[PDB]
Design a protein around this ligand. Structure first.
Ligand SMILES: CNCc1ccc(-c2cccs2)cc1
Length: 115
């Protein structure tokens, strides 16, 4: 199990997302996010004004962890619940959500730390 894995994540528009979060506690959302990333069933929503209030907390963000092998920006997971974050990292790339067949607008290449 390598420390990092290259993934191409489907980028979803928030209004298309059918399942708006991964669960109900910080530990669950991180766990489920990781399982969906493993299974190829995880999408990414880019954060713009109006996005977060349309998604369910706790949130799972991917944040930049370094400073980009082979096109894939190195990232790690950080969860947020009620204004508190669980992890510290760099800039947010987006919020992770389950992917259940929505049509993406792009794919985002990342090198994800499995931590
Ligand atoms: C290439 N697809 C295989 C694979 C994908 C993702 C992961 C994980 C992501 C986060 C924790 S495990 C592991 C294996």
């Amino acid at each position: 199990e390598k420390t990092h894995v290259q993934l191409s994540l489907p980028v979803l528009q928030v209004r298309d997302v059918l399942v708006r979060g991964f669960g109900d506690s910080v530990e669950e959302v991180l766990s489920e996010a990781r399982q969906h990333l493993k299974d190829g069933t995880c999408g990414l929503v880019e954060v713009e004004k109006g996005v977060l209030p349309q998604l369910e907390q706790p949130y799972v963000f991917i944040k930049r962890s370094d400073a980009a092998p082979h096109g894939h920006v190195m990232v790690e997971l950080v969860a947020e619940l009620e204004g508190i974050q669980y992890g510290r990292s760099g800039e947010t790339l987006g919020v992770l959500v389950p992917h259940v067949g929505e049509i993406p607008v792009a794919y985002r290449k990342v090198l994800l730390r499995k931590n």
